[PDB]
Amino acid sequence: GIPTELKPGTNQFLTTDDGVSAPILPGFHPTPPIHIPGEVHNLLEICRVETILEVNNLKTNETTPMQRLCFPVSVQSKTGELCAAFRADPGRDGPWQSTILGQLCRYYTQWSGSLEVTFMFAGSFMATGKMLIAYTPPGGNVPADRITAMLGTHVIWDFGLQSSVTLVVPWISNTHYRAHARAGYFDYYTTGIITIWYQTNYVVPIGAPTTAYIVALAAAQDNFTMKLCKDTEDIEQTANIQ
Amino acid sequence: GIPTELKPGTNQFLTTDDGVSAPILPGFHPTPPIHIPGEVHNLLEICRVETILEVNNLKTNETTPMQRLCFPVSVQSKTGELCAAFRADPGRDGPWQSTILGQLCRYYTQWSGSLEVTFMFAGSFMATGKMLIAYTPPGGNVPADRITAMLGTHVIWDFGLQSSVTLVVPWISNTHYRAHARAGYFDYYTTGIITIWYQTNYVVPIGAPTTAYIVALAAAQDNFTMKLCKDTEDIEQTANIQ
Amino acid sequence: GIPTELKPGTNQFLTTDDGVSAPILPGFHPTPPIHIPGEVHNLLEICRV
Amino acid sequence: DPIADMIDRSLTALQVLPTAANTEASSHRLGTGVVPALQAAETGASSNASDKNLIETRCVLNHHSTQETAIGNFFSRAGLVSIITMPNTDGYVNWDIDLMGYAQLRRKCELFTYMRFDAEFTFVVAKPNGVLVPQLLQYMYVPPGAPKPTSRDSFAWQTATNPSVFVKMTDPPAQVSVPFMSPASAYQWFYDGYPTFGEHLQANDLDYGQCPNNMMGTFSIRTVGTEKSPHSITLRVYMRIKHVRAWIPRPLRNQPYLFKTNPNYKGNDIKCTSTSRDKITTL
Amino acid sequence: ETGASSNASDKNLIETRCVLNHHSTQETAIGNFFSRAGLVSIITMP
Amino acid sequence: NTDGYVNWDIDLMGYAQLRRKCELFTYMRFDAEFTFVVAKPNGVLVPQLLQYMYVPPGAPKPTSRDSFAWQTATNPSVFVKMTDPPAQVSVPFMSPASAYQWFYDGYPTFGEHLQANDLDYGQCPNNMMGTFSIRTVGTEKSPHSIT
Amino acid sequence: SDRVAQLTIGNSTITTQEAANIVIAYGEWPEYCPDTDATAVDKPTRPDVSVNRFFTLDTKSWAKDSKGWYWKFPDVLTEVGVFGQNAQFHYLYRSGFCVHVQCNASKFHQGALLVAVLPEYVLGTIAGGTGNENSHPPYATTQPGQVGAVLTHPYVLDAGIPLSQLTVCPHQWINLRTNNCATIIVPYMNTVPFDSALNHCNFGLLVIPVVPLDFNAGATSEIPITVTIAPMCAEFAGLRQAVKQ
Amino acid sequence: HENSNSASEGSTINYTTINYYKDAYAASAGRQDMSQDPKKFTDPVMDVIHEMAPPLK
Amino acid sequence: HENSNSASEGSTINYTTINYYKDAYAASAGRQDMSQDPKKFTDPVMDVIHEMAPPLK
Ligand SMILES: CCCCCCCCCCCCC/C=C/[C@H](O)[C@H](N)CO
Ligand SMILES: CCCCCCCCCCCCC/C=C/[C@H](O)[C@H](N)CO
């Protein structure tokens, strides 16, 4: 017949290799498909759906974990207090691990694009107030007061009929992609610090309660992308299943 | 020569694989074929031919098995008695194991389409009567009386010159195909219960005998199909042949 | 299938051989390149300095 | 027409997006009435505010491809599904086909509700310390309803109809292709209800969640000879997933698994989803 | 009695709807039924 | 190492003959092709099953010979024997930046630089590509030394 | 001008003055099964007036420390009305739904409800506490009927998945300072075109209070919640005598 | 071409068979025909019976 | 040709698949489509909401 040689790479089992294999059932026909609603063609259609962010992940809330989804805002006596702060790393552990974006970024390594964070007020109708939500690019720590934190990108929120505001976190980085940030050398890929401040006080009349809550939602923008699929570390198998 | 590599799947002997093999006789010519009548092109041509159903498969008829093909109908004193009942599973053991359809379904796993059951009266000429043949979809057990069983699909039979009636069992199921039903979890693929009732009495004049018999034939309709060939379990080989 | 034979030269690892190998990441895309000044196309551009 | 009573819309259609969407330039804006920063999350729709409606942006042409996020490239990777050992002691094992025995592939497939795919199976077999001994083996797939072999030399090993592979230990690993073979139109990993009719009691309570459209029979291996082989065997089965179509996504599981058939979890240590910290103001 | 099977369909006994089925009859051909290797002999040299 | 598995951090500057050629240029952009030649420490050959697994940075690493990380549900992996021809793979250009660089004048992180953090000087995270892990396949202790 | 809404179908009509928009689950309207996907040969029956109407279930009480409730579909409607009769005399059904949840409070209360429709909601146990028992939920828990059952560990939804990403399903919010109702329209979603109504339950409806209800003492401390549902395009086939379960 | 010597040459099966040798019985099976004739097994009757009329009148 | 029996035949993926056997499920995966539809998951709302206007007026 035809002369050949076998090259290196022979008789190896490569798990991500794509080839043609022999079938076991000749002439088989499957069941004809019917129209089922909600077909997913791409994994980026899920990453634009907002889910709840776990901002209030304290050490005392481990036995009553229903309170970790809402963080409180109360009447202050002073001005310019901060209510919450967290890092904006979707891949690092912390508040972003509870999202459908934070669980889907763990199956990859490098990501790019912009995010968005939606806050929703859930107090009474008679209550009012104004909040300042700022995003600071890396280089500095959390700001000590309001007059330092207002230098970055910031949006002033007003309570009223429309009870939702979206702070968009724009993509400001030196590289085209970002790996998963971590303590050590990989904090070079950090992305910033998001804080939130009292613009004015939280003013309430007589007969309405003095403590309200705020839920926070997170999603991705349309120019979001990922690459270099790997496995997650959130799941494990120490004992054998069944 | 040309560089190649061997992939996984090398040097395996796959029994249902189709390939090209080397011949042993070069230039051989077979005997020229002649026209022989009765050529079978497809196995569904056999499944439309009716064969006899073994309805009367009792424990006392194992030493005289010629009586299992006919089940009796006699003069009743009461009204609305039932004469026979069986499941309509062609793959489960029972009355359908004696058919050429029931033996050909054992070589497959999943089937679809409608059936038909033909009854033929074999009494005297002067005798008469009317019977009710009902098919009940699954969910209930065998009906206790006639007025429950007439709610399903049913056909009223009249004896006379034409001594054959065909109850067609229509294809009513949730899935496109059905596996072989069995006790356990696979009774989800059950298909119903077929009973038969006295519409009126069996009336006979003087001088003609008071007991007649009924034979039952079964076949498949034109939209019948099968898939996923496997082996049967009706045959065995414990001792070595010869 | 097609009849073949293996010739001499089979299963050797030649370090200066040029061939096609299997990839490990299907559908991967690299970072898009930017214009960086001072591209060397040939080693004889250094020998004239 | 004697009876005037008897005579008597999709939302969005799909489109191709090869690259991520660009960013167009913008300027400042001062005006009343128009406001994209204020939304209402109560309606269940996500926000549509872009970057250019909140700050001023430049023009950026990006060519980032979205190829790696497709469902075909996400699933077409071989993962471990079974470890089968022959110390069982009679030279043969009958293993029931259940692909939920290892948690790393179970978490990925439970992300969707309905799935429809063709597989590709690969068998890697050696001694329990990786050692190699020349030995002849036989694999046989048994569909549901078929008789199963009860001994090393039964009549079921004649394989007159069953698909089967004969392969040695020193060879490259065997590979086969399996088509989509369910009676329904798609596999489902969740089935809320009972498979059978009749009364449900405490004796039949284990039926809850067992759908017969996923039970695919069993799988049997043996050493070929009629005598007792002197070596211990260990098989590892890897499965790839091709031509994927999925439907109706779900939340992902954050609790460790306990059994292969039900979503039961440990009720004492409920694991919090995020790693806890000390204060809300200090990261 | 004539040895011919019946020709009654579903629509002549009950009322039916319209069903377009695409079930193939490929697996029931005689070529696919027989083209499977089976054991015919065991020959030993003691 | 003595437990049948090793975790080797990917660093291609361990042998001077290739380090001198690649340090002739400053920025480089390329695709690689890796080949693994494996035998006993005296060239002897013994039939033995092996597994290679590439672990990207951020992924969990196997800590034992029979950990759950060896299931390779996502990770690229090769299974190959000792008697076989050597394995070969192809690796694309995978840096977050546009090109690899062999020299990086500065510190990777912000904040104060002191004598405790002085070893950070010259470590660019666009070149750290995770780790690499091999093992003998079986759950017991293999009796041979591998190289 | 879109805060008011009116839904009429059958001989029933629902009106609301502070309403959010209408959610169509996955952007598909419910419809009768076409001939290209049908497998049953019997002609189906369509009652088309007596089953396409609004049915009102019972009324729960929202306290200050409530966990949450769930209803299994269409187990809630299988014993009421003529839809309770056609689902007992047949073997196959196929229908969409339209869920409407009402809960109203004054301008001095506060709270937030998360309504969500979740298909193939398979419940689990706590596996005997320590995790070694292969426990199973009883029949009274998995199919409660038109009363509905309460949740025990709502942080994991009694199924091992967290609450924090439940919004990937079709969902709405009932925030007590803006609106008082929520409405979802669900089409028929299953792998087979018809199914039994007594052995299969398509989806579950979950009402979980994320932000707790709070008020000052003296106000109306009785906050009720009432669910109202309606089938859309119901068909049935395969007639047989009455079997309840 | 090839000296055609198979088992099925008079009334044959589909034209997708692959062969590398010179004898036609070395070739593969290929995919099969969909042809069938039921009425010479289910209706082997001289006088034609219609489904509407009585068959024995 | 080949008796087409795959998992994705109604709405399929790109036309670069390679196959040497007669059954279509033996073929490779090939490269995938770039098609996606986000708005049936991010905007499942009957009345259309514009980004400029107030959504609740
Ligand atoms: C020679 C080939 C032998 C291999 C035969 C493999 C055929 C069986 C393939 C099954 C495909 C998946 C079906 C269901 C998967 C899961 O086990 C069930 N969903 C369990 O929930
Ligand atoms: C199954 C395949 C496993 C092999 C995986 C290899 C991927 C890693 C390739 C790295 C490419 C070079 C990146 C940097 C090289 C040097 O180590 C650094 N510059 C150190 O300074």
Domain count, chain D: 1
Widest distance between CA atoms in chain B = 97
Kindly determine whether residue C34 and residue F98, on different chains, have CB atoms separated by under 8 Å.
yes
Which residue matches tokens 């001198």?
F20
* Encoded tokens for A121: 């007020």
Q: Determine the distance separating the centroid of ligand 1 and the alpha carbon of A30, expressed in angstroms.
A: 15
Q: Judge whether G159 and G166 are in contact, CB under 8 Å.
A: no
Report CA dihedral (G172, G178, G180, G181) to the nearest 10 degrees.
-30
Strands G181-186 and G23-24: parallel
Q: Are D50 and A222 in contact (CB under 8 A)?
A: yes
Three-class secondary structure of residue F9 per DSSP: strand
Q: I touches F (3+ CB pairs < 8 Å)?
A: no
Distance from the alpha carbon of residue A241 to the mean position of ligand 1, in angstroms: 18
**Ligand 1 pocket, D75 CB below 6 A?**
no
Protein residue closest via CA to atom 6 of ligand 2: F91
Chain-centre distance for alpha carbon D45: 29
In a 13 Å sphere around the CA of B27, the CA atoms on its Cβ side amount to: 0
The DSSP annotation for G54-101 comes to -EEEEEEEE-TT---EEEETTGGGTTSTTHHHHTTSEEEEE--EEEEE
Look up residue A95 and give its DSSP letter.
G
Is-contact B170 B103, C-beta < 8 A?
no
Alpha carbon A122 to its chain's center: 21
**β-bridge mates for residue I36, sequence order:** D15
| Dist. CA D162 → ligand 1 center (Å) | 16
Q: Is the CB of A22 under 6 A from ligand 1?
A: no
Residue positions counted in chain F: 147
Contact B14 D163 (CB under 8 A): yes
Q: Is the CB of D184 under 6 A from ligand 1?
A: no
Half-sphere exposure of F133 (CA within 13 A, CB side): 28
| Pairwise CA distance, residues B49 & B218, whole Å | 8
CA atoms within a 13 Å half-sphere pointing along the CA-CB vector of G63: 6
Look up tokens 């660009």; give the residue: D22
Residue G19 CA to ligand 1 center (angstroms) comes to 48
Q: State the best of B7, B15, B189 to mutate against chain D, taking most chain D CBs within 10 Å.
A: B15
| Residue F113 DSSP class | -
Residue A189 · residue A81 · CB < 8 Å: no
Q: CA I53, CA I57: separation in Å to the nearest integer?
A: 9
Which of E20, E21, E24 should be substituted to probe chain A, the one whose Cβ sees the most A Cβ atoms within 10 Å?
E24
In chain F, DSSP assigns E strands to 5-9, 27-28, 32-36, 49-55, 77-81, 87-91, 100-101, 131-136
CA–CA distance, H30 with H16 (Å, rounded to integer): 6
Within 8 A by CB and 6+ apart from G90, the residues are G45, G197, G236, G237, G238, G239, G240
Evaluated on CA atoms G98, G99, G105, G111, the torsion sign reads negative
- Tell me the CA–centroid distance for residue F20 and ligand 1, in Å: 53
Put simply, the chain B residues between 5 and 24 with a CB less than 8 A from any chain C CB are 19-20
Documented resolution in Å? 3.6
State the DSSP code for F135: E
CA–CA distance, A38 with G25 (Å, rounded to integer): 9
Tell me, in angstroms, the distance from the centre of ligand 1 to residue I5's CA.
18
Q: Considering only CA atoms, which residue is closest to atom 19 of ligand 1?
A: D214
- Which residue, among A237, A221, A239, has the nearest Cα to A116 in the 3D structure? A221
Alpha helix positions (H), A57-127: 100-104
Instruction: For chain A, list the contacting chains (3+ Cβ pairs, <8 Å).
Output: B, C, D, E, F, G, H, I
- How far apart are the C-alpha atoms of G212 and G47, rounded to whole Å? 43
Counting from 1 in the atom list of ligand 2, the atom nearest the Cα of F95 is: 13
Domain that holds residue D282: 1-283
Distance separating alpha carbons of residues A80 and D121, to the nearest angstrom = 63
Give the count of beta carbons closer than 10 Å to the beta carbon of residue B130.
15
For residue G112, give the nearest of A235, A124, D181 by alpha carbon.
Answer: A124
Give the residue from G138, F13, A11 showing the smallest Cα distance to D174: A11
Give the whole-angstrom CA distance, residue A241 versus residue D11. Answer: 43
Amino acid at G204: G
d(CA G155, CA G161): 8
Residues D188 and D176: their CA atoms lie apart, in Å, by: 23
Measuring CA to CA, which residue among D112, D99, F138 is closest to residue A241?
A: D99
Residue nearest to atom 20 of ligand 1 (CA): D98
The closest ligand to the CA of F14 turns out to be 2
Residues of chain E by 3-state class (helix, strand, coil), percent to 5? 10, 5, 85
| HSE, side-chain direction, 13 A CA sphere, residue B145 | 3
Task: Tell me the torsion sign for CA atoms F99, F103, F107, F108.
Answer: positive
Domain B1-242 sits in CATH at: 2.60.120.20
Closest CA to A54 of A40, A66, A42, A43: A66
Pocket lining: F34 vs ligand 2, CB cutoff 6 Å: yes
Residues from chain G that touch I49, judged by Cβ atoms under 8 A, are: 21
Q: How many CB atoms within 10 Å of residue D10?
A: 8
| Residue H28 in contact with partner chain E when CB distance is under 8 A | no
Q: How many residues does chain H have?
A: 57
Nearest residue CA, atom 13 of ligand 2?
F127
- Distance, in Å, from the CA atom of G181 to the CA atom of G73, rounded to the nearest integer, reads 20
CA distance A193 to A133: 11
Closest CA to F56 of A99, A185, A179: A179
Separation CA G158–CA A238 (nearest Å): 23
Of D221, D209, D211, D114, nearest to D162 by C-alpha is: D221
The percent of chain G in helix, strand and coil, each rounded to the nearest 5, is: 10, 35, 55
Strands A2-6 and B2-4 come out as parallel
Instruction: Please spell the DSSP secondary structure of C27-41, one letter per residue.
Output: T--PPPP---S----
Cα(A116)–Cα(A221) distance, integer angstroms: 7
Residues of A in contact with F106 (CB under 8 A): none
The burial of B60, by beta-carbon neighbours within 10 Å (0-12 exposed, 13-18 middle, 19 or more buried), is given as exposed
Rounded CA-CA distance D74/D109 in Å is: 11
Distinct helix (H) and strand (E) counts, chain B: 2, 13
How many Cβ atoms from other residues are within 10 Å of residue B18's Cβ? 19
CATH class, range G1-245: mainly beta
Experimental method: cryo-EM
Q: How is D2-54 classified by DSSP, letter by letter?
A: --SSS----S---EE--B---B--------SS--SSEE-GGGSPPP---STTT
DSSP secondary structure, D192-227, as one string: -B-SS-S---SSSGGGTT--TTS---EEEEEESSSS
Rounded CA-CA distance A202/A77 in Å is: 10
Residue nearest to atom 8 of ligand 2 (CA): F129
Which residues does D217 contact at the CB level (< 8 Å), separation at least 6? Answer: D96, D97, D141, D142, D143, D144, D145, D146
Provide the shortest C-alpha distance from residue F39 to chain D (in Å).
Answer: 15
| Alpha-carbon radius of gyration of chain E | 22
Task: Please give the structure tokens belonging to residue B239.
Answer: 């001792």
Question: CA quadruple D66, D72, D74, D77: dihedral positive or negative?
Answer: negative
